[PDB]
Design a protein around this ligand. Structure first.
Ligand SMILES: Nc1ncnc2c1ncn2[C@@H]1O[C@H](COP(=O)(O)OP(=O)(O)NP(=O)(O)O)[C@@H](O)[C@H]1O
Ligand SMILES: [Zn+2]
Length: 422
């Protein structure tokens, strides 16, 4: 079995990762056939973090690109497509400075074109792209696009699909198949995959990624309290105000000190109140909304919640040792976590402590996002799983992106399968 390869660089807001995928040459159009071969994490920040030094964006990719030359057999380099796709970090930089954004894309382009792979371009994905391609990855890997049954006895209704919730560093996406009528063309997606029509809803909330939410809570805590009720008692840090208010996500909060001391107080109730200010539920120009006046039909079906949903839930279960099987359990785990002092929290984590002071805020954010924002309840929440991998492949938008650009999912089966699915 001759294999083929393809490569995607996911240039996210906080990190770039490289995925190399492989599949058999003569089975390439079967669903679920493509899988991850290897991956590489680029050291340092995302490409948008090089906005004032765009040369370093391209250079940052070199070590992982050297790994790709070793991971893919040499005689296949020339015919292996290589893509770079960038997400909300670059969408935010594009708001601030389209020129700096262009210089970063130019610097990564120049680096990538020096390599022997068939480089097909560096692009910023839309929020819709990001949501939909994540949904295609999960469902492709789990073989949900197979028509189950056999002639004369097809399963009905057809096999359900897995909704996707992705909590990145600078935006978050929700995407799922729905039977409700569309009310906003911005959210409406129609896919034709293996001869079947999928009616999908998607939305991306810019500035609702983990790192931007933490920045917004920090801005809010500085304004309202001059302490940080989500941070643990005994933790303090010197906050440089310029970093807090430079983001498009926080410049709306700006209130002439350069640096302020800010300490935690382990106040789970005040933390909950701080997080609640993130969601505007005051108006809805549609029949129903999620939040911020965005149309959303009722959630339905199973969901996979990956990226920082998985990392936060993994902290709560594995480090705090708390169950999160229900929304009530998640809320209780968040309360217990938020009420820990800094010495108590550190006692649970013998190794490196990065992100530890932030789990209370992120867990509170996720609980409110699911319950207040998307309107999960106990019944719908029972159908959510927290997982970051399927069939030995990382779940994210990268695979679905590669599948689309490489044209590896047919709209129709060959010969329409003689019309046996009609
Ligand atoms: N191994 C890990 N453990 C705990 N947290 C992590 C880990 N890796 C990443 N994170 C955090 O989780 C958040 C989302 O990470 P990731 O999904 O890599 O976002 P991204 O692709 O960089 N951002 P975006 O461009 O908005 O999709 C970031 O705030 C990360 O710092
Ligand atoms: Zn991402």
């Amino acid at each position: 079995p001759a294999l083929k390869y393809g490569i995607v660089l996911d240039a996210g807001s906080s990190h770039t990762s490289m995925f190399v995928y492989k599949w058999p040459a003569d089975k390439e159009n079967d669903t679920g056939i493509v899988g991850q071969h290897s991956s590489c994490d680029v050291q340092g920040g995302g490409i948008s973090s090089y906005a004032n030094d765009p040369s370093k964006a391209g250079q940052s990719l070199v070590r992982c690109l050297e790994q790709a030359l070793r991971d893919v057999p040499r005689d296949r380099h020339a015919s292996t497509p290589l893509y770079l796709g960038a997400t909300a970090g670059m969408r935010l930089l594009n708001l601030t400075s389209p020129e700096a954004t262009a210089r970063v894309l130019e610097a990564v382009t120049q680096t990538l074109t020096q390599y022997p792979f068939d480089f097909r371009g560096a692009r910023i994905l839309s929020g819709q792209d990001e949501g939909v391609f994540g949904w295609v990855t999960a469902n492709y890997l789990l073989e949900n696009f197979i028509k189950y049954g056999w002639v004369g006895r097809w399963i009905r209704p057809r096999k359900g699909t897995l909704g996707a919730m992705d909590l990145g560093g600078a935006s978050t996406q929700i995407t799922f198949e729905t039977t409700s009528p569309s009310e906003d063309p911005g959210n409406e997606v129609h896919l034709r995959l293996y001869g079947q029509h999928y009616r999908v809803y998607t939305h991306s909330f810019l500035c609702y990624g983990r790192d931007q939410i933490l920045l917004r809570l920090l801005a809010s805590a500085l304004q309202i309290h001059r302490f940080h009720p989500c941070w643990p008692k005994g933790y303090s840090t010197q906050v440089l105000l310029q970093e807090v208010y430079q983001s498009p996500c926080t410049m709306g909060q700006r209130p002439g000190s350069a640096i302020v001391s800010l300490s935690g107080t382990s106040n789970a109730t005040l933390c909950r109140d701080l997080v609640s200010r993130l969601f505007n539920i005051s108006s809805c120009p549609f029949s129903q909304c999620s939040f911020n006046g965005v149309f959303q039909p009722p959630v339905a079906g199973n969901f996979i919640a990956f990226s920082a949903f998985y990392y936060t839930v993994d902290f709560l279960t594995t480090v705090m040792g708390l169950p999160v099987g229900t929304l009530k359990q998640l809320e209780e785990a968040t309360e217990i976590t938020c009420n820990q002092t800094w010495t108590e929290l550190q006692a649970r984590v013998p190794g490196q402590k990065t992100r530890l002071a932030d789990y209370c805020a992120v867990a509170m954010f996720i609980h409110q996002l699911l319950s207040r924002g998307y309107h999960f309840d106990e019944r719908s929440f029972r159908e959510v799983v927290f997982q970051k991998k399927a069939a030995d492949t990382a779940v994210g938008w990268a695979l679905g992106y590669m599948l689309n650009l490489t044209n590896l999912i047919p709209a129709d089966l060959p010969g329409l399968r003689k019309g046996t699915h009609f």
